[PDB]
Amino acid sequence: SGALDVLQMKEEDVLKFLAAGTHLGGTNLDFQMEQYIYKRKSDGIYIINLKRTWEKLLLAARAIVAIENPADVSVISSRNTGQRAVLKFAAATGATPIAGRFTPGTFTNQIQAAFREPRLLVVTDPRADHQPLTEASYVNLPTIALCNTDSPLRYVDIAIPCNNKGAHSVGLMWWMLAREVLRMRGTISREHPWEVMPDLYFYRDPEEIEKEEQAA
Amino acid sequence: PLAKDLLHPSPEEEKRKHKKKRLVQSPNSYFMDVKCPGCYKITTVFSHAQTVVLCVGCSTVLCQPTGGKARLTEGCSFRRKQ
């Protein structure tokens, strides 16, 4: 972001990106998201250019650093595949998480027990989270979003072009956004990698967890 | 959308467009040297020719008119111009 020779992509970054299957997208394309595609391979899967989503991650991180208070940032996920991840994203910085079913009127109905007034919104899945985008379009609330190729860009201000259906890709990209905001927020440096493994943010299936502790 | 330099379009987009709908219109055709296999003369042939072009020395059929580009016979060589 700026060709300043410190915020560029690394070989480990591209290796782990291709390992986690983030770069490959869906089967649909929305015309507002044509600039994040490199090309269309004949198999039918749109690939997402890695430098474009790197710069978009850096822009989202620059937007989220600029808020001095980490408490008034909402981080929401309705699908389970990112749910626990955004909870640990709270453990990244303290941004308040909302996992599971979203209560209507959370942002717009002031006579509620759960009535929050954030300053940025970060969304795992725009299709499952249509109600929080609808409510964010009523209270002057900007929006970060993890957007696949088959994702609408209405009321979306930064759309992170990534595969968000798979658990590994969404957990990785939450971990990468957390690492960037913690890197240039002031907590950690650049000479040493973050001690938190990417597999910690990963959503685990109950079928996986019933046979994970069997191999102890 | 809402931000694209109409004065400087990408060259693949200009070649992609219809020949009249470019920024400055231009034809898709060309002229070409044709060398008959039975001789070594040069014949100047339009790519989208509508007449049967005959050899000036051999009096042989060089191209066959088609709906679009002319079909050169087998054995003759061709080279584009300019």
Binding site: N140, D157, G186 | -
Partner: protein
């Protein structure tokens, strides 16, 4: 706005949209104002400064908002030109 005496006769001045230069109305509840932080050019540290972009509700409703923010970031040099 101003009378011939030079006085400022107006309630206030509205913010103009950074994308399409539209006046952001007082009851435009879908419009945003966003702050993007820059970093130091040698060490990548948040130095406290910021840049401000306002997008009206019509541009956001069209879905053409992130394109506008990317173009503005290109204009201010935040996003690199090797895009």
């Amino acid at each position: 706005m101003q009378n011939d005496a030079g006085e400022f006769v107006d309630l206030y001045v509205p913010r103009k949209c950074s994308a399409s230069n539209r006046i952001i109305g007082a009851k435009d509840h879908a419009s945003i104002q966003m702050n993007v932080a820059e970093v130091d050019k040698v060490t990548g540290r948040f130095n406290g400064q910021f840049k401000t972009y306002a997008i009206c509700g019509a541009i956001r409703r069209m879905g053409e908002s992130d394109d506008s923010i990317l173009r503005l970031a290109k204009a201010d040099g935040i996003v690199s030109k090797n895009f």
